[model samples]
Target: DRPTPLANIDATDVEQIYPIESIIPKKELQFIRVSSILKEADKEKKLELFPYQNNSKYVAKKLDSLTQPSQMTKLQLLYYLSLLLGVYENRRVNNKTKLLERLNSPPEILVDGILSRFTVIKPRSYFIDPQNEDKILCYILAIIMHLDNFIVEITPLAHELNLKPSKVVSLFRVLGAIVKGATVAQAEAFGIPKSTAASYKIATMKV
Candidate 1:
C-alpha cells in the first residue's frame, strides 16, 4: 500500500529520483510488486491462484496504470523498501537489514538483523538479479558511497516512521563501511585510488 504521507508527491516528482536497472527482469519485479500489493491490500487469499492463473496480471496492470513509466534502479528499489517499513508504524525494524536481506539471506551483522524485521520479499533466492547477481550488491554499495544524496529517498521514510536519523545513520554507517571496503577493492582491481579514504571520496565526489 502507498504511504498516505507520500501521497502528495506527484508521480512525476519521483521520476529519475535515482538510477540503475537490476539484472532482475521486469516480470520478476512485477510479480514481487504484485505480491506485495496483494498482501498490502489484505488480499493474501488471492495468492492461492496468483500470477499463474489469478487476476494478478490485472492487479499488476491496475497498479501500473496510475504511474508514469520509468526504469527503476536498485537504490530506488531500496528507497521503496525503506518506505515499506513504515507499515510497521510502531516502527521497530531496521530498514538497513530489510534491504541487506534482499541481496542474500542470513545477512549476519554485528548487530542482529531481526530488530529491523524488514523483509524485501518472501523468499531469499527469488530475489536474485537474473543477469548479474553482484550488480545489486554494487547498487547497494553505490548508495552507501554517495549516501547524503542517496539517502534523500529514505529521509522522508525515516521521519514518517518516527525513527531517529542518528540511529538509522548509525546502522547505515556500519553497512556503508562494508560497502566502502568493497568499493575500495573494486577500485584496486581496476588499479586506481590505491586504497585510501581520500582517494575514494574524491573519485565518488567527481562522479
Candidate 2:
C-alpha cells in the first residue's frame, strides 16, 4: 500500500510552482544503485551475496571489501536488519533459522527498536507482502545513511526502479521520512537521524 500523501504538498499546488520537480535524495539513491550493481555482479559470478551459504570466507571477504569502504555505521546496520525483521518473524516458527541465527546479534533490540520509531510501513509486517524487497532495502539503507534536511530528485529514482514517482515518495515515507515537494516527483525528505538521542531502551549486549 502507498503511504499517506503529504498534507501540504498537492500536485495542483506544485504545478503552479515549478516546471521541474521530481526527486530522491542522491546519497540514498546511490545506495540503491550500488546494491543493484552488486546484485548484477553476483548474477555474473563476480561477487557473492552478503549472506551466501558456501565459503563464508570468500563471501565475507568480498562483501566486506565492498561494504567497508562504504562506511556502514551501527545505526545503518540496525536499520538494514530491522527493515527485514519480518522475514525473521515469519520464519521464527519454521525451520529457516539460518537468518535468525546469523542475525542473532540484534536479538530483539533491532526488532523492538523500529517499533517505537515513526514509520509508514508496519515494521513487523514489512517484507511479508511481495514487493521489490531488494530495492526497498536499498532505500532503507540509504535513508539511514544520509538522511538529512535536503530535497531530492524523486522521478529519476522512480525511473531507475521502474516504479511510479508517488511510490518512491511513499517509500521514503515508509522509512519514516517526511516527504514534501511541489512536483509529482519532487520531494524534500527528513528521515531519522543517526543520533542515539531518540532515547529508547538500550539493548546493550555483546558487540
Candidate 3:
C-alpha cells in the first residue's frame, strides 16, 4: 500500500504522477486518538494522534515550489498538513460526527485539486506569501485528496494547519490560468502506468 518511492524529483516532475489512485489508500491514513482530549487510539503518535515524517519529504520534492507558505514545524507539519484536506467528523466539542473522510482519493483528482488552489479562482479571490510553504503544500495535498464534491469549512483546515480562519479566508482563493500539458517524464514520475499516462490529459497550470 506504499506509493512508489523516489530519491529525487522536482515540482514539475511530481505533477504528472498525480491522481495516481492509491498505492497507499487514502482510507488507510490515520492519526493518533487521545483521551481527556477523550479517546485512546494510535496510527502514525503525531501520526496516530498525528505527521511530518520522512515519506512526506518524497511528497514535497515532487513540486517545483508554491507561492504562499504557512505551517512549519518541519516534517511533522507535512504529516498533519494532509489532515486538513479531509472531512472533520470527530471535531466538534458537543456534536462529534466522527467523519474524517480523507481517504479514497484517486491521485489524479487530488493532484489537480491541490494545484488548482493556486489558480482556479473559484473559491477565494486572493493569494499568499503566507506563513509556510511546506505546511501550505501539505494542506493543498489534503484538498485534492477529497473524493467527493463537497467544499470543506475553514475550521478544520484552520485548526489542522494552525492558521487563523481570517488567514484561511485569503488562502482559500483560486488564481486561474490556462494549464500546460504534461510530458512523458512528468507523468512517469507521478507513478502512473505507462498505458494510462499515454492517454492522460495532463492538465496543469502556470503563471
Candidate 4:
C-alpha cells in the first residue's frame, strides 16, 4: 500500500519530521541495493569519490554557534554519501544472494561490518562536519520526492536545479536512485510514499 504524505515538509526539513521507516519501508530499507562499482571502489581502499580537499576558514575560529543535534546519524549519512558518489540500484536487483545478503543487513550492522573489516569509506571528521548536516537533509528530501511515482526521473531535476549532470547524478545517488543513462537516473518508488506531490510541486517552484 502507498503511504500518504504525513505533512508538507521543506526538502531541508525532512529529517526532523519524517523518520527513515516512513519514507522507506522496512523490507526496502533492509534490502538496499549495493552499487558494485562503489562496493569495489571501497573494497580497493582507493580515495573517496569526493575527498574534502579544502579546509573551511571558519573551522579555525573558536565559534560558539550551537546547532541542535541532527536527526540523521553518521551511518545514514554515510549511506547517503555513498549514493551521491555512485549510481546505486533499487529496482531489478533485489538481492537474493551474498551481496544481497550483505545489503539486507541493518545499516548499523553493515557499517559495523565495514569498520571491522578495516575499510572505512570516510573518516570520523567527514561525518562530524557541521557543514554537511543541512546538505544531507536536502539530499534526502530530493531523493524521497524523486523516487515517488509522480516524479520518476531525476534528469529534469538537473535542469530544475541548474546543476551540472554529475552533480545531479550524485544527488540521486544520495537517495539510492538507479542510473538511467547519461544525465539521467530513476527510482521505482519502491518504499517511497505516494503523497510527495507537495514536495515535488514546491521543489519545482523553489529550484
Candidate 5:
C-alpha cells in the first residue's frame, strides 16, 4: 500500500518533508539487525577510519542508522552537503582548482565584516517564516552564482583565487534549484538536463 499523506499539510510543506522519507524507508525494520551490528562495529572502530577520507562514509553510516523522522531531518542536511562535496571531488580534475580559490570564498575577515555590519534585529522573527527562508536561500544562491562566475570568467585572474573545483560543484548541489534557475549558462554548467530544468524551476518556486 502507498503511504498516506499527512492531513492538513499544505503543498509548500511537502518537499521539506520528502527528505525525511528518503532517509527512512517504510521497510526499515528489516535492516534492524544489520544496523545494530554496524552500530556496534562503528562504536568499536572495527574498521580503520581516516577523518577526512571517512567523512562521507561515516555520515552515510549514521544516516542509515536513524529510524526517526525528526533525527533524519537534521542528518539530511549533512548528508546532502557530503554528497555534494563528493561530486565536487570527482569532477575537479586539476589539483590546483580547489573550491577555496574563489575570491569571495568566505574569508575570516569577510565573515567578521558582515557580522559587524549587521544591526541585530530583535526577536529574530524572520527565522520562523517560510517566505523568509526562501528569500535567504535565494540570496545565498546569488552570491554563490557570482562567485562561480568569477571562477569561470576572470582570465589570468590569479590561479590562487580560483575556488577549489570540488567545493564549487558541491556548493551547486546544496544551492540546488536556486542556482539552477538563475541563468541558462548556470543550468548547463551544473549538468542539469534540458528536460529537467523546467521542472526544477517549478519545484524551486514552491520552495
Candidate 6:
C-alpha cells in the first residue's frame, strides 16, 4: 500500500527551501551492498582479486596504469572489495570473530590492524531517513577522518559506497562546507577556535 502524504504542503515552501532535485527520497532508495557489487563486477570481468596493498610503489604504479577505461573499471572494483572487507573486518573484530576465514593467516593478519577504528553511530536503520540525512554525512566524515589518521587510501572508502571518484570528491566538498558552517555557528555561541569546536561538533553530530 502507498503511504499517505503527511501534509498538504505548497511547492514554494517544499521545492525552494528543500529542493528535491538532488535529494533521494528515503523510501524509494535501496542500499547497494558494496561488497556484492565488487564481487559480481570482478567475476564478470575475470579479474583476480587481492587484498589491499600497503606498498607505496605498488599502489602508485597500479593507479598510474589505470589509463585505459577497462583497467580503471577493474581497479575501482578491486578497491571496492578491499574497502568492504576492511569495514567488515573492523566490525567483525568488535564481535570477536574474523568474518573472512581466508584472511585469518599470516600477511593477511596485518589487515586486521589496518581497519579504521571509527565507530558507526546510530543503528543502521537511521540511514534511510531523509530528515536524518546529517547522520549519514557525519558517519562518512568520521570514517574518513579516522582513515586519514592512518594514511589509508580514501579511494577504497569511496568505492565501498558505490560512488564514482568524482562523486566522492563532491561529497567531501559538501562535508567541508557543513564543517565550515558549524564552525561559524559554534564560534558565535562560544569564544573557541573553529578547530577546537570542530572536535565537539563532529562528536555531537552523530545521531
Over 4 Å off, model 3: 1-43, 51-76, 79-83, 86-181, 191-198, 201-205
**Per-residue alpha-carbon lDDT of candidate 3 for residues 39-97, written as tens digits (9 for 90 to 100):** 22222232333322322332333122221233121222233334333322212211111
Model 6 C-alpha lDDT per residue in residues 56-124, reported as the tens digit of each score: 222233343344454443344334334434443334343213434433222332333222122333431
Task: State the weakest 10-residue window (summed lDDT) of model 5.
Answer: 152-161
Give the higher-TM-score candidate: 3 or 5: 3
Clashing residue pairs in candidate 6 are: none
Q: What is the lDDT of residue 177 in candidate 3?
A: 16
What TM-score would each prediction reach against the true structure?
0.27, 0.28, 0.26, 0.25, 0.23, 0.24
TM-score (C-alpha) between model 5 and the true structure: 0.23
Tell me model 5's lDDT, rounded to 2 decimals.
Answer: 0.31
Number of backbone clashes in candidate 6: 0
What lDDT score belongs to each candidate, Candidate 1 first?
0.31, 0.34, 0.31, 0.33, 0.31, 0.34
- Using TM-score as the measure, which candidate wins? 2
What pairs collide in candidate 4? 83-173, 84-173, 84-174
lDDT for 43 in candidate 1 is 39
> Model 2: per-residue lDDT, tens digit, 1-207?
322212234324422211111113223322322343243444334333222222222223324334332543322332243434333233332222344454423334433333323222443332223333433343332333232213444544454334466666655555444554343212112232235323211111010
Scored by lDDT, model 6 comes in at 0.34
Model 1 clash pairs? 93-116, 94-116
Candidate 6: where are CA atoms >4 Å away?
Answer: 1-46, 52-81, 84-96, 102-106, 119-170, 174-207
Worst 10 residues of 3 by lDDT: 88-97
lDDT of predicted model 1: 0.31
- The residue ranges of model 4 lying beyond 4 angstroms of the native Cα positions read 3-17, 24-75, 78-90, 98-207
